Enzyme design. Structure first.
Site, short mmCIF file in Angstrom:
data_model
loop_
_atom_site.label_atom_id
_atom_site.label_comp_id
_atom_site.label_asym_id
_atom_site.label_seq_id
_atom_site.Cartn_x
_atom_site.Cartn_y
_atom_site.Cartn_z
N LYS A 34 0.83 -1.19 0.00
CA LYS A 34 0.00 0.00 0.00
C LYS A 34 0.87 1.24 0.00
O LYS A 34 1.78 1.37 0.82
CB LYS A 34 -0.91 0.00 1.23
CG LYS A 34 -2.08 0.97 1.14
CD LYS A 34 -3.10 0.47 0.14
CE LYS A 34 -4.51 0.79 0.58
NZ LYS A 34 -5.51 0.08 -0.26
N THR A 80 -4.52 -5.05 1.16
CA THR A 80 -3.77 -3.80 1.34
C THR A 80 -4.38 -2.76 2.30
O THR A 80 -3.65 -2.02 2.96
CB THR A 80 -3.51 -3.11 -0.02
OG1 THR A 80 -4.75 -2.71 -0.61
CG2 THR A 80 -2.79 -4.06 -0.97
#
Lengths: 317, 322, 321, 317
Positions: free
Chosen positions: C9, C69
């Site tokens: 991320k 994520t």
């Protein structure tokens, strides 16, 4: 007299499968006849105005304040219910809804920049065709519109309406020099490279709603006109160029009162001159300063050229 | 009878070194700023030429009365060398008037400028940590702005538009802020304390426009002083909204500088979203960036507003004493 | 072990308020920076997870062993609340190790962060002009950087990469910089100069001999980016440089001199000489403008062995306060 | 064990006009791209010089063996006029080798380039709406990238690094991800992706385009990515980029590997459709974005082609 407004900016609104724009006037400069509106997306900015907003500033009184977060919800919900096919129509639709909902407001202003997507070609078992599922986010030219609606003693009226196309960037790979200018003590060939913003205004503002598509002027058509005139005309300056683009647009769209321009000259510097024309030529980016022009062309200008024996204005038949 | 018609040159970077210093500013409680040495006097300028005699350059492609945009660039850069003043507004008016004197066929000249800002820095020397007179940091924070437009009059020229400002003030206040009392209806987000984070653009207008030239520095309003006022008011005031805040910032500025007719504001609310609530106020709290939409305000405060507040028995307006 | 494979991320904005302050830094001649109050401890973090067991998430679309994520984002944000240290490097290593402890199928975790920087400001009060403890300015100038990657080992975990730095230092020196003596041939158009107004962008990084010094448990062994920045500025001020190459070599030497616990200092530089438009004095009263887009750049590393050589050479030009 | 040491010039804009056209590319089902006219052959180049003999330029301020960065810029721009090839990779290797031949004290030269991209456009003419040969649109969308580094050998020079790619592909797919880990950290639409794709040649000379049938054009790769995105029902971006890679390797066996850098930029839902996406409204999410990095190799494709549980399908030739 005082400046007074508040609102919400960067209101991203992406409506899918809005009603398609179809039935546009066919013109020689363009093949654009419809806009399927599979994605009808924009970056909106809304401002609320009114005398009754004063104490929100002077007294910190939030009693008559529509929360900016609520305005965002308001815009997004109306994107779902809107049944039209144009940006201008949507903005006027939202403006009027705000005024109907909140009687203490005097005026509402909406500005929007298209969140643009491109159709793309994909390979399928039936060959290479246009995809109806996958689209490219375009970082090129985009449609713009502004609508402000104010309350009147007898209802509402549109007090400002603007339509446009922003960030057209075009280069012409032909010789261009630009001479005859004033030469004095402040005085110190290449492919003319221009940035163009084009806007226009309607005689009858309802034409922008797209209720009768033959009367709607699509930014895509204007862009194609600009590209075509740029292609065909032997221009003497950017000033000269945008005058003829303007004349041509007004010629194709008599329902427009005016077309305006904001330009940048971003022509490269020559580093290696070509051996025959631009064959073998090398250019690079110039120093940052850029020439710019602002100009408006009106129907009266078009009438003048058409009646002048000395006119150089020519349009496709 | 009024078509839009102008042309010019943008991104005209002009960096003058060792310009005359701005000194003798009015001392105010909100600021220690009294002088600006102008060792670097730099800006991004944008010039536009206007006049009826420019028409045929568009309609006929006739460049005979066209001052080349590259020539405009040279004109500005050369006048940056000869300018003997200490202010941005003064420089722009000097250039505007110079253009009009040189080219009789022009009717009006417009100059817009964004300061190319630099910071003094502290360096180690054998004499200790001192301010460098050789090395400066390019500031990408707030910067000074100005616009001057000069048009011809029956007896000469006049300033027909003059603006002064400070752009891109970005301030956060780490204290609890809420904002309540707004309209609640069907458009109100379902969910029901964050550090107010604001972007501020501030502008002002002079009663007598010549005050912006700095020939008498005591009448010159430095953007740096204005910035310090905004920061001080933000710090001290317990605000009820950004609307409420900028009203008081505006009053304070007008109070310190009576030669101003108006102070205007353009603001953004860029307050973070809470992710982890603090366990003692903001102690242990975690925030993150919000979705893109931002609240904004535009507003002007005028001397009449200040006089009214000072004459009001219920006013909450308070300023630090001289 | 030849395939590229990771996921994670980016743009994980994490803003902790009232973190433990950094104080007790080494006092040096080039800087007055001794403490960082950490009232706001903010960053833009980027996390990447690595491991062989992630293969089928790509090859088979099997999400069974996938930490989604958004979950990584939550994980990081929650650990920002619990972190009890005072440095960026310490926080990142803290998060990396936490991930590995939580998810046994992971082989390695990488964290990169750019500081979300704020400035202390002066405000007017009834007691005069003081530093505000409530209002701070968002800085768009230089910012602190750090990278920590931790991999699983047979006996626990180990740091496989640790980086510390300062990015986007932009400094101008009006005079006191020369560029001459370079190769002159058919491709040279550039005039030789004994004096040019040198304008530089600088990214500076460093590596610790003992990597735990970066956690800041002993602040005297912690190298604060603010100190490094002040060193660079001071050297730029004092040295009559012959090029940017020459300049950054001396900046590096000076940094290593102040901080012997560092093994190396590295540089990524960009140079922007303004173009002269009106020559000034001399150089007072001159007017400059921005040049065309091309910029010179340099990449270079200085190590303790370089400093040792300079200190022992009779021909050395290296001088420190 | 070795210090970092290099210097050079960045933002070297080089715009060559009427370069030799790229023609004779391999025809594939996923794309219609067979030629690139190269009327404008433009890029943002970045050059870095390396060599042991550069040490004293840092350590002693000795400029004797320093090629001034301004001179490097000139060197590149001058080599743009004489370059007779048709590919970005070929131009970069050509310049790298030229530098090494000119300056014997250099050990290696590295060039990185980002295409300065232009689009063909349609214009209205007396002969109808056609593609212009004079006017082009500057594209701010996806662009070609390449890196070439050349180092000395005892007998000449060799390519020690070669990269080819396409950057900033932005695609959205309008149609309707599960099965990931659910624990205390788990809180969790038209999939919207950003894609950078790169590839490596088995024979690096194929990148020169001397035999165009062996040159892999970025445009073809992009069309493959778009086509796979369109047809494949993906279970994740990880799964998607695996199949894009396989298809590319399938079309171009002369490639050893394809690599990916992705971003997930999927919108947040604001108004749910009634139903499907009819009447739906989305908005931009908070800044955090998922990203993936991955490389696919010929061995992967060979494995899939021989596997009974393989789900890999490609369009027929």
């Amino acid at each position: 007299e005082r400046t007074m407004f508040y609102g919400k900016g960067d209101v991203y609104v992406f409506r899918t499968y809005a009603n398609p724009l179809k039935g546009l006037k066919q013109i020689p400069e363009s093949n654009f006849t419809e806009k399927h509106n599979t994605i009808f997306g924009m970056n909106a900015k809304v401002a609320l105005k009114g005398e009754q907003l004063l104490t929100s500033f002077t007294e910190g009184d939030n009693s008559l304040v529509v929360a900016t977060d609520s305005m965002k919800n308001f815009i997004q919900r109306h994107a779902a219910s809107y049944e039209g096919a144009t940006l201008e129509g949507f903005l006027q639709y939202v403006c009027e809804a705000f005024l109907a909902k909140y009687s203490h407001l005097d005026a509402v202003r909406l500005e929007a920049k298209e969140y643009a997507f491109d159709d793309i070609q994909v390979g399928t078992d039936k060959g290479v065709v246009t995809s109806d599922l996958v689209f490219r986010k375009s970082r090129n030219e985009y449609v713009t519109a502004t609508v402000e609606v104010a309350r009147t003693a007898s209802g509402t009226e549109v007090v400002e309406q603007a339509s446009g196309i922003a960030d057209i960037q075009l280069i012409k790979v032909s010789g261009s020099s630009f001479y005859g200018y004033i030469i004095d003590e402040y005085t110190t060939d290449r492919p003319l490279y221009i940035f163009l913003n084009i806007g226009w205004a309607y005689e009858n503002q309802d034409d922008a709603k797209g209720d009768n598509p033959a009367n709607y002027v699509a930014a895509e058509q204007v862009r194609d006109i600009a590209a075509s005139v740029f292609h065909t005309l032997d221009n003497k300056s950017i000033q000269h160029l945008i005058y003829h683009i303007g004349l041509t647009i007004l010629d194709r769209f008599p329902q427009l009162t005016e077309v305006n321009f904001g330009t940048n000259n971003r022509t490269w510097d020559t580093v290696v001159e070509g051996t025959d024309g631009f064959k073998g030529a090398v250019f690079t980016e110039p120093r940052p300063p850029f020439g710019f022009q602002g100009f408006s062309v009106h129907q009266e200008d078009l009438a003048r050229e058409k009646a002048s024996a000395n006119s150089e204005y020519v349009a496709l038949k």
